[PDB]
Structure 1
Amino acid sequence: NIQVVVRCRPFNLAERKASAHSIVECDPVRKEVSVRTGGLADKSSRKTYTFDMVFGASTKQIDVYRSVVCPILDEVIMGYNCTIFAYGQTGTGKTFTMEGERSPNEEYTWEEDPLAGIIPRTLHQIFEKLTDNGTEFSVKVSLLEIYNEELFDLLNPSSDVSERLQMFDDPRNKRGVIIKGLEEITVHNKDEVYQILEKGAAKRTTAATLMNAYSSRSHSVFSVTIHMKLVKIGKLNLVDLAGSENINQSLLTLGRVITALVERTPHVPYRESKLTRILQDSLGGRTRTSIIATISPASLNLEETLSTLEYAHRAKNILNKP
């Protein structure tokens, strides 16, 4: 049963200057979000949904990590496969949630930065857990991106981002695919990390000057494979999806895969897109998923917010087999 959580961000300045009202209420204890749908017309209308965890505008980066990821990180160290993806409207915080930011000036080190998000926190903590256990581990990471249904490789040594990968069926495996051409960097220890992400960032920046609406329109899959010793392999995909408001084929297919999965029909159209193929095992496969849905408090965003909470809620019905 894929775990589904909801995080809502603080108003931004733009919103504040617009005198925006909040339409969203977060009750952690009841694990409920409930939205105020009636406007000036009906003041009592509300839509209310129940999720596995709920995180409010107040919620800090460390709280998301603590609640969502450690339980997750603990089953990859046990040799099981774990996806976490971020779903929602452009502007609502899925990048801030999977990656995070760096606090102005210095004031902090990437390892301790408050605005640090999941990927930095997970990577960083995969050694302090495995190093302190004094066992054998090798961790490697890869980061690709889907745009207009073409795969690009942000970690590749090639100096040019626009060189495209290709995908074929794993010669031995049913639900997996192989990405032909995809660089996988070995990460030897904590101090190699920032360096890699900083390079991924730079290539990502170039990608944005090259392609239209690259940030909002593109999917990003950061994978982390861990090797342990009989040997055990843990593997964690951290997926930051394109905006849900939205060439978009991978997003459609994603909907249709879910929708087919919960209505239980015979052919789930995984194949009909790139993302659903890379991610096939994460939807009704043997991977243990989570979906952090991402929403905004403002009244302006109401229609989109329900749309998210609706979509995210159905997903609670999808059943895996780890």
Structure 2
Amino acid sequence: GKNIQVVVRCRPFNLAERSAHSIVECDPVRKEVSVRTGGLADKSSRKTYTFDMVFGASTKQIDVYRSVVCPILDEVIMGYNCTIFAYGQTGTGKTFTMEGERSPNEEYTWEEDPLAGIIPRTLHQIFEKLTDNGTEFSVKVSLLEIYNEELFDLLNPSSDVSERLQMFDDPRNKRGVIIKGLEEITVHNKDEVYQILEKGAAKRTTAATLMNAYSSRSHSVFSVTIHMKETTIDGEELVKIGKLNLVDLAGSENINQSLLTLGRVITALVERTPHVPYRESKLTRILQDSLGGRTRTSIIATISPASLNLEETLSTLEYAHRAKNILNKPEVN
């Protein structure tokens, strides 16, 4: 098989956009997204697509999590490598979804903030779930940013802020690679996560001021690895290793080698062309497994309601729809 998952999430209007009206309507039950392509004179022309899941503007973070992220976490705990990423135009919610936002004036703890996104939630759930099944386990996390074909580690303490790091192909996995010098931190309890993110958050900032049009132009890849012990009825011991990669892509509005290449790889997979160009960009190289690989991958494509962004929105959905045909064969480690 076995197919990958694509879901669409559309954000609500800004204060700013309030005074417009939407051309996008998502009907979750039917799993469709409809966009009005006509402008002011047609109103009846629509483009509609069907995705595995569709989340409208009414959707809270919690819902997104339960709907797509939870199931994935189950798999990760079983030993699968899972990748989830966000794709969309800038300003449409990728960053929000994957990481979320922290509400102001400590109203909520990090754990209960409802603006929190997938990453922090995921980190939280992991400790809960794992802890609740007894068993020895450990968590390692890493975060890297890819800007302009250069990789920067956001968790490194080093004052060698932008030391480019190097990757090599990994022999153990033919579709994978290792990044030498990438810091991986072992997180021992839920109480250490926030500190990491925050730290990570800061370092990203520095780099922002280290280079041109950052946020919107680079990709961030967050990864968690989990090793859990299990015992069979026969005393044989099992070790499961699972990895979840959560990535926040660069705006689809777009030096952009990683993104282009990605589109290219996708086309190749979908069309069956004999040689697929994973090697052409740093990003595709690390996500090779995800696309046509051994991992289960989910893509969240985020779009916006505003009339203004119609062309981008349409393209975002086109892209998403066609990615639905990638096939992966998920396997357990």
Shorter-chain TM-score tier: over 0.9
Deviations, residues 107-166 of structure 1 (Å, cap 9, x unaligned): 100000000000000001111101111111000000001101000000012124312111
Q: Percent identity?
A: 100
Offset at residue 168 of structure 1 (A): 1.0
Q: How far apart in 2 are the matches of 1:91 and 1:318?
A: 26
Match of 1:300 among 308, 318, 325: 308
What is the CA-CA distance between 1:305 and the residue it aligns to? 0.2
1:33 aligns with 2:33: yes
Q: In 2, Cα distance between the equivalents of 1:97 and 1:156? A: 24
Question: How far 1:248 moved relative to its partner?
Answer: 0.2
Aligned partners of 1:172, 1:5: CA distance in 2, in Å? 32
SS in structure 2 of the partner of residue 243 of structure 1: coil
Does 2:70 correspond to 1:70? yes
Moved more, 183-192 or 162-171: 162-171
Q: What is the Cα deviation at residue 180 of structure 1?
A: 1.2
Offset at residue 172 of structure 1 (A): 2.7
Structure 1 stretches of 5 or more lacking a match?
Answer: none
For the residue of structure 2 that corresponds to 1:156, the secondary structure is coil
Q: Look up the match of 1:213.
A: 213
What's the CA shift for 1:15? 1.4
Paired residues for 1:113-124 under 5 Å: 113-124=113-124
C-alpha separation between the residues in 2 aligned to 1:73 and 1:91?
27
Partners of 2:301 and 2:122 in 1: CA distance: 19
Report the alpha carbon displacement of residue 41 of structure 1 after superposing the two structures with TM.
2.2
Superposed CA RMSD in Å reads: 0.7
- C-alpha separation in 1, matches of 2:96 and 2:118: 9
> What does residue 223 of structure 1 align with?
223
Residues 45-76 of structure 1: per-residue CA shift (max 9 Å, x gap): 10000000000111000000000011100001
Aligned-pair CA distance for 1:171: 3.3
Report the CA distance between 1:106 and its aligned residue: 1.4
Report the CA distance between 1:303 and its aligned residue.
0.3
Quote the offset at 1:231 in angstroms. 1.1
Where does structure 2 lack aligned partners over 5 or more consecutive residues?
A: 230-237
In 1, the alpha carbon distance for the partners of 2:318 and 2:290 equals 20
How far did residue 43 of structure 1 move?
Answer: 1.8
Q: Distance in 1 between matches of 2:161 and 2:304?
A: 32
Distance in 2, Cα, partners of 1:159 & 1:227:
31
Q: What residue in structure 1 maps to residue 161 of structure 2?
A: 161
Q: d(CA) in 1 for partners of 2:148 and 2:142?
A: 20
Q: Post-superposition shift, 1:255?
A: 0.1
SS in 2 for 1:317: coil
Deviations 1:202-228 (A, max 9, x none): 001111111101000000000000011
Q: Which runs of 4+ in 1 moved over 2 A?
A: none
Deviation per CA, 1:161-187, whole angstroms, max 9, x where unpaired? 312111111133210011011000000
How far apart, in 1, do the equivalents of 2:54 and 2:311 lie?
20
Secondary structure, counterpart of 2:97 in structure 1: helix
Matched, 1:253 2:255: no
Classify the secondary structure of the residue corresponding to 1:225. Answer: strand
Listed one character per residue, the Cα deviations across residues 266-292 of structure 1 (whole Å, up to 9, x for unaligned) are 101000110000100000001000000
Deviations along 1:67-95, one digit per CA (max 9) or x if unpaired, are 00111000010011100000000000001
SS of the residue 2:39 aligns to:
coil
Name the CA distance, whole Å, in 2 between partners of 1:138 and 1:130: 9
2:4 alignment counterpart: 2
Deviation of 1:21 (Å): 1.8
* CA-CA distance at 1:189 after TM superposition: 0.5
* Residues matched between the structures, number: 320
Rounded to whole Å, the distance in 1 between the matches of 2:273 and 2:218 is 29
1:247 CA drift (Å): 1.1
1:289 maps to which of 271, 275, 297 = 297
